[PDB]
Enzyme design. Structure first.
Site, mmCIF file in Angstrom:
data_model
loop_
_atom_site.group_PDB
_atom_site.id
_atom_site.type_symbol
_atom_site.label_atom_id
_atom_site.label_comp_id
_atom_site.label_asym_id
_atom_site.label_seq_id
_atom_site.Cartn_x
_atom_site.Cartn_y
_atom_site.Cartn_z
ATOM 1 N N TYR A 68 41.435 33.239 46.429
ATOM 2 C CA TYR A 68 42.867 33.276 46.819
ATOM 3 C C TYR A 68 43.726 32.165 46.190
ATOM 4 C CZ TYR A 68 41.800 36.772 50.369
ATOM 5 O OH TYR A 68 41.438 37.923 51.009
ATOM 6 N N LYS A 91 26.642 32.263 47.708
ATOM 7 C CA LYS A 91 25.900 32.789 46.585
ATOM 8 C C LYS A 91 25.748 31.651 45.549
ATOM 9 C CE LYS A 91 23.903 36.632 44.917
ATOM 10 N NZ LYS A 91 23.114 37.770 45.506
ATOM 11 N N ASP A 140 24.777 38.429 50.600
ATOM 12 C CA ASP A 140 24.333 39.831 50.604
ATOM 13 C C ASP A 140 23.352 40.105 51.751
ATOM 14 O OD1 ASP A 140 22.395 38.254 49.270
ATOM 15 O OD2 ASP A 140 22.107 39.650 47.632
ATOM 16 N N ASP A 147 36.746 36.712 54.472
ATOM 17 C CA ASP A 147 37.580 37.877 54.703
ATOM 18 C C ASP A 147 36.655 39.053 54.952
ATOM 19 O OD1 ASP A 147 40.119 39.564 54.483
ATOM 20 O OD2 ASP A 147 39.061 40.246 52.648
ATOM 21 N N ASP A 198 35.762 41.037 58.901
ATOM 22 C CA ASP A 198 35.947 42.472 59.140
ATOM 23 C C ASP A 198 34.642 43.183 59.543
ATOM 24 O OD1 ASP A 198 38.705 42.467 58.479
ATOM 25 O OD2 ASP A 198 38.456 44.404 57.488
#
Ligand SMILES: [Mn+2]
Ligand SMILES: [Mn+2]
Lengths: 327, 327
Positions: free
Chosen positions: B118, B163, B194, B218, B222
């Site tokens: 972002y 990661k 993952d 983000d 969700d």
């Protein structure tokens, strides 16, 4: 004969590859297998996770069968064997198929495999760390084409998953995916990476050919796994223009290594995708697996009490019985 | 009085904010509310999703209450209202709390909110699109500190999700998170983005304070939502050094706008986090919501037949009854 490089790796890698090779041997005698070491041992000894000279045989083979590899976080200069082979062998398309093994329903994921956040431009300088997410016209195009062929082949559509709202590279990537799907008369549904995680757990089976960027695909494909019960039944292909490599989605699982309980289905079904790639059938293995699971005791990760060997033998059993209807 | 800027936004934004303001009014008369427009209308008219002069009042207010905003994909030069306000007001820490509303168990996510993918360095040039994932010492530190205070406050630990194997910025970020958690004697569990998607759907409640990079957060936040039944019960705070903004995690939901069925619980509980920020209680609202859901008919997204208004009134009801035990 077809020449197939086999790279067991380490951890449970050997165990499940032994499984997958025996099953292949039971469906075709038309493949020679050549074994190569790879992983931290090779690195410790030579500076690379794969030896140069092996990599040269590997790249001239018809296909690769790959187990799993432990990539330790705290080993300086060490790069993942699979990530290395992906870039060395040109393997830009990763295809993961998550099956509900009773119903036969599938989640189909096409992960772009050569670029994105895996392209490898990163640096730190003056308390500023950076990684460059690179999407490239040729990379977007070839993976879009690959995804449309998977759509066409299934009479289905493409769900392109992204964050184009925030990421300029995904805006670019979207454009390209839409053009080629246009050229080819394939539908392209938008999905946003954060809300699509919800759609993927709640409505798994209705998204057609999922396509996304490398890291996004890495993330989505592990999530899709919940709908198969274990990650260890899920196969994959890594495809490039002159060769392909096949590996179960699962990893080393070093904690259960050598205990006889690993699920070989991921490797086996990867063996199937390999036969398809060579133009042998693979269908036989898929039918044999499906056939076996209707009443076979499964591995502990699936909740059963079966050993790795019971599943392997069980599937070979189904294969021998299946052989007699070329018809 | 405390001065609180309120930005309803659009879509279901107004409906759920009307809900959340009335509930606030029912627990404290110590807050003045000032309403500001924001979104595409403001953009179309002025070039910005928020007017400069409003942004100047907003930034001198004590806190912000924000509904939801429609960010249309196909509107050139338009940036998300919430993303804009996050950067303008210095809101570097995003805190999302997903509740299992019966048991009271919680998933706690601290999303870094000012940088990562972002930060906004992106470009296209000669068929090459790029986005720079930037992690910065000051950004890593302040969000690490924020996450340790959430850990301490709960007598809990930090799950740092990353990661680092592939992303040099996550290697950097990990280092910093571990140092500050060391300084402060807080435990830090590693998780990989993952495989953590699997752990998050299968073992939601056992990860303490989840911390990650912006886009990762983000995505995770969700996903965590599946364990609350609807995204529309989940609240958030966006915190910076001199101010904070509170919004439900859910979005515009333009398709059900104006139909009376939106879930206000997300906004309401966001109103709670706002009261906490001001040093009023918020506990009362949380207790009132919990109290209401034991036997209240809920909204359609939760499976019930209740209208937005039934839930709002129902919760106010519990609040009025709760008031009389300052004790
Ligand atoms: Mn992965
Ligand atoms: Mn989001």
């Amino acid at each position: 004969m077809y020449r197939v490089a086999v790279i067991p790796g380490d951890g449970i890698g050997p165990e499940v590859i032994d499984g997958a090779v025996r099953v292949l041997k039971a469906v075709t005698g038309r493949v020679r297998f050549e074994y190569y070491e790879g992983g931290v041992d090779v690195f410790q000894e030579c500076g690379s996770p794969i030896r140069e000279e092996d990599l040269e045989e590997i790249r001239r083979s018809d296909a690769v069968l790959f187990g799993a590899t432990t990539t330790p976080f705290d080993l300086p200069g060490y790069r993942s064997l699979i990530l290395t082979l992906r870039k060395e062998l040109g393997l830009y398309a990763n295809l993961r198929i998550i099956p509900d093994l009773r119903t036969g329903r599938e989640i189909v994921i096409v992960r772009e495999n050569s670029e994105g956040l895996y392209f490898g431009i990163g640096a730190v300088v003056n308390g500023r760390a950076v990684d460059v997410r690179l999407i490239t016209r040729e990379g977007a195009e070839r993976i879009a084409r690959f995804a449309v062929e998977q759509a066409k082949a299934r009479g289905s559509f493409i769900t392109f998953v992204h964050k184009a709202n925030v990421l300029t590279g995904d805006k670019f990537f979207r454009r390209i995916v839409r053009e080629v799907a246009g050229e080819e008369g394939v539908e392209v549904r938008d999905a946003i990476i954060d809300s699509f995680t919800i759609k993927l757990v709640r409505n798994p089976w209705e998204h057609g050919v999922i396509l996304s960027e490398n890291l996004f695909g890495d993330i989505l494909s592990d999530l899709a796994t919940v709908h198969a019960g274990s990650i260890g039944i899920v196969p994959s292909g890594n495809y490039g223009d002159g060769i392909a490599l096949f590996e179960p989605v699962h990893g080393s699982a070093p904690d259960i290594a050598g205990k006889g309980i690993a699920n070989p289905i991921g490797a086996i079904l990867s063996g199937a995708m390999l036969l398809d790639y060579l133009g042998l059938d693979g269908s036989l293995i898929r039918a044999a697996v499906r056939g076996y699971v209707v009443n076979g005791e499964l591995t502990p990760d699936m909740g059963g009490r079966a050993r790795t060997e019971d599943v392997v033998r069980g599937i070979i059993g189904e294969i021998e019985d299946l052989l007699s209807m070329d018809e």
